[PDB]
Amino acid sequence: XXXXXXXXXXXXXXXXXXXXXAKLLWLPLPMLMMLIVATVGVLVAVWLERKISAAVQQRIGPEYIGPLGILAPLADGLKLIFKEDVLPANSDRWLFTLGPAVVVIPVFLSYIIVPFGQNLLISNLAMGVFLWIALSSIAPIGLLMAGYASNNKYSLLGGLRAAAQSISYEIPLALAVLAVAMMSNGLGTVEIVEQQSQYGILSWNVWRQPIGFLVFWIAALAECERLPFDLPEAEEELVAGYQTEYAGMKFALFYLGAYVNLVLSALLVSVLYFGGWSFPIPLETIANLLGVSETNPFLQIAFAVLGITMTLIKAYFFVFLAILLRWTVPRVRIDQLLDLGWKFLLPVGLVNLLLTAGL
Amino acid sequence: PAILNPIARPEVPQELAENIILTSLNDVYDWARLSSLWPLMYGTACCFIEFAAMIGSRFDFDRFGLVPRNSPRQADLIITSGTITMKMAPALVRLYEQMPSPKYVIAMGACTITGGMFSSDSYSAVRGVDKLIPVDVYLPGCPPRPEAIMDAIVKLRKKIANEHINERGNLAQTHRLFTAKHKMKPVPPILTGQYLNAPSRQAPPPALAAAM
Amino acid sequence: GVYGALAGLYLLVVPAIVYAYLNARWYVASSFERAFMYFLVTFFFPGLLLLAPFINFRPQPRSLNS
Amino acid sequence: GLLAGYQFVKDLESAGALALFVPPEGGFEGRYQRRLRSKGYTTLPMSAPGLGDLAAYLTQEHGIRPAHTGKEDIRVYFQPPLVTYHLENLPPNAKGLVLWLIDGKRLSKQEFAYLAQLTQTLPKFKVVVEVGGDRVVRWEPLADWVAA
Amino acid sequence: ATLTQTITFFALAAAVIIAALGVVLLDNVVYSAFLLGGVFLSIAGLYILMNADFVSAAQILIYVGAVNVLILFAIMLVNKRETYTPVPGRWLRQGGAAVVSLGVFALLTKMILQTPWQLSSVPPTPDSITTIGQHFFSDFLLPFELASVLLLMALIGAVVLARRELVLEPEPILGEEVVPPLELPERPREP
Amino acid sequence: QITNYAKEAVQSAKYIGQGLSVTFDHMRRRPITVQYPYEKLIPSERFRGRIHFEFDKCIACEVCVRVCPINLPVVDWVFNKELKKKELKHYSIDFGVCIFCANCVEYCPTNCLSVTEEYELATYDRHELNYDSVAMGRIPYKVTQDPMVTPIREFAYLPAGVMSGHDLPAGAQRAGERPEAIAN
Amino acid sequence: MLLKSTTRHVHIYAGHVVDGEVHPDTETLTLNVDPDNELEWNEAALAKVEAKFRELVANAAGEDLTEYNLRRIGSDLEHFIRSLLMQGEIGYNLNSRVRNYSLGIPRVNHS
Amino acid sequence: GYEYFLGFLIICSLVPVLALAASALLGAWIQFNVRYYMFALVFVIFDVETVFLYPWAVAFHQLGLLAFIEALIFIAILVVALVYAWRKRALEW
Ligand code: SF4
């Protein structure tokens, strides 16, 4: 019991500055400027989810809230904070609350990697395309405590099925980063976008890694998206999966934290295989997806904000392509999910690593 | 007495004090719950196809923020799109108790309002869904049009906005729990999970096959 | 990293101009133009989210000329 | 605007018979009967098409015949008068009641005229009718609305 | 930056031994398997303080990301084993192991504090991912190739030991004197 | 093989690429939807919305009660032996028990009961649906006389060829009702 | 198993209740009248329902513990609670969010 | 250089939990199908393979050709580990 006095010894000794320096939250301005761009990266991806999925179905999408659904990600996220989140009756309590936290704090901490904009980089760590695949492997644990602590039979079945899916698609995702870590001679995500900043478009890694972009793309969407996911129990293998007994603010981590995972996946397709904050000649004509003049005040305000946010704008394209793949591929079953990340995506991710070499 | 089924006098003063700041933080509490409320993808009888036609492209579901969530926990609204018999009446109260407390049932069709055309002579039909669960909006029709239920969403959306934030405590059920002991014999469960490998399907029994 | 010089023109001024464009031609827009309409919401989204309850896209009252 | 104060309550204390004009998508009327309910006024939201003759339902007792559906006989349920029996139940600390008549588009012009003058003769009783639609929530007195 | 690095050591060094006392002393075995990741994440957080950014990420990927997941898939395959739990099994020899561990800890702390360590004041690790992969192919090349044979064999045996024999389950292939399938021919006998 | 595996990926990832060309071409089409509270779709000429009642035309026959599937409408009549003709004193149909089968408006001798156009009846209270004789004897909400609602027509009312109600500047139904009264 | 008879007002479970979680028993029958507060109760009338609840459980203690027989107790309980409204003992709760008047409207006696 | 002051604050806000954690110490079948183990078993063998390739691939052009044949003996012997798991139905589900 000699460690009973130990944990309260450095507790109050740290608490004197843990309350005193508690008010100064996000004291660096490029940390607060990131978290606003982090939040509106996710809030687009909920608006872009409901609007692109309505466009492929020839319905409107959310009108009547905001101008054209601009507040529809906000009200869908604010109603979950206001709902009286009550636990199931016979269940765990501590494992139930940290259920969604272990799933989504990995995709929040590993948001510190992505260098969106030439003048917005939070920290250039010594790695980070390896720290991302390390941190995202904590997420199968949270799918096991969401499944266990919810204490119904069908969410254990959904918890063991969601964990064994994320198990299967992390190892081809590890080798798809190993292709562009071999070309870039490093894991630094500033060094990775620096090898693609030489010729603008013709030096992007998707032109050099046509298969490894496809290994990354199928493995990323098999860990964040809605297309290869049995959490909709339309096959009735479970009731509703591991996200069954989760209501209110804990479900908001399962709901909105799957869009942080979609954006962070898309933010790294547009760093590895596409040049992060890289773009062609600014002084272009009216048909350059811009205005009509050559030097507008609306075009001096674009490239100043495009200078701080271009990788996320590129990530807004692969968010759009992930929704356009949802209404294209069939909802494939779990027996053919795990026969893809092991029997198909693991050899062609290993073959690409040898073809990224000389062999 | 003097008036049957009376209304009890609210003896509390109902001091619902609200300044400019709390009323602004109450309009956001109501707008976020009316403009994005999620219906449980539920329905038993014919009236679900008048509700599933509202998921489609002609009448848009996700236009009022309705996203059909096929789980009782993630949903709040429950449009009772079907006749409730003696069976499924325990199942419906279970899907209603498994809900975060700003619930807002709306009835749908004649057979959840008063059990409409089975209200005359039918031995297992609940005559109205509000014999089981408390309902917000009613909706006559058999079936209603998909336009007619979107008016009942609009009538529901007008009812969320009236809800003050200081009345969140009255949304929880109260437990006037009483207990009693009985002498009823417990019956073994008749519905066990074996159908094909039950010991009566493999072969016809004796004293039956002789006449065959 | 300024207060509102190259930020207030992005958060306050230009989103009211996209809302003059988004309210005018969104449903009557083309197929090539609507791809640019989705980009204008997607790029200017921190400004369009701020001046969101200060503009309404509800259609005008009908004439009833009979 | 967004931060509406309590000006809606002051017009109902003055006019007594308001005529709301709400957006048809719904959800923006009821923020003005929270300002009304925070100021002591209880609210009784009725549906305007379900009322018959307004004199016989509101200020008089009415024989409401239930659906016998062939199995019962013709019962007559004499319900108490709506705007009277509800005035005798709110406490004397609280102020009057306001009739929040939704779906007021289908009332006759001689039924708003009865609802206008009824707030005069009855102390601590007001009405709000949701007649018509407009893109912004706007109100006017019912004596103005029967003119146009 | 010294005080923030110093008190984040004891914020992690207390987090690992509380989770280590959590995996050992808790009555629920499932709570131990989740707190086991609290052991491994803290030590992987302790390598960032010790300039080991690769092995920190190699611990989250393997220990937390793979081994802790493999524990949990095996914890929840054995949950119907024994709900009896006779914690006082036959005697109080569960406290007879409390003095041997504290005797080891008193022995090692006697060593650690009094041993003069040869601390080298050389500026360390200039991007130690290239100085860790030059060691995989110059110094520790032969451990690196043999660790591949280790992982093959640990996959041959564990697939063999944990598969369900659905090829031929009632197959006692021959007999001189009768031997059951997948059981050693030395039959149990009481003298 | 090492060449067979990297070339087994191109045969699918091209087929996925010409799957995304189809789904993006689904976004080329105009959203053929009905924005409800601002574009209410017009009900048909035989749509049975709710019943209308004429108290000066109901001579207490109780045919509506005998042909209703659940004997719903409450005809309340005295005999009035001074006049020797039953004059009713109350009439009410309890909507919400109503299926809108409209057997009462069909076997009506006096054309007193009649279906309206309005489906937009929905209350907070169940007993507010018990419409009186003077609550059923009101004006139906016509969809086209709303200065907020742009009413779009229905299929089998558009002209011949068009299958949508939004690109409809004018027109009529698909065929004339009496063209062959002056023609043939 | 949780044999239960849950109408709007009368929730009868076959078991005892420990803070929301119900453990199915064989001796007990728990009962919470009016979970959603549609009626304003008092201690004089709650004892009348609780004496009625003792009356039906003791009377029907020769039958079989099925969900049909619990649904007969909760039917006779809900028929008893409605007679306490037509006697004017209890009344409708106006503080409830919904006023659908499930047990009949308020009405005066003999006009 | 600001993530480390952030990363200090993620742990400095949880020191109140470590004080309370030390005071805390002082008809439902799931059928046993061994595929939950066997899919993580083959994951453990290959997550350990791939973490050996990260120091090789970062310093790939800085090592030579004999260090590329050496990394092939690592990789080609766990191609045999992968095709063992296919033929023996380890990852069948
Ligand atoms: S009222 Fe008609 S449509 Fe509705 S549930 Fe009953 S039978 Fe089905």
Ligand code: SF4
């Ligand atoms: S069926 Fe028609 S004519 Fe006959 S009593 Fe009824 S309303 Fe009058």
Ligand code: SF4
């Ligand atoms: S609407 Fe139909 S069911 Fe109802 S009373 Fe009239 S005929 Fe009978």
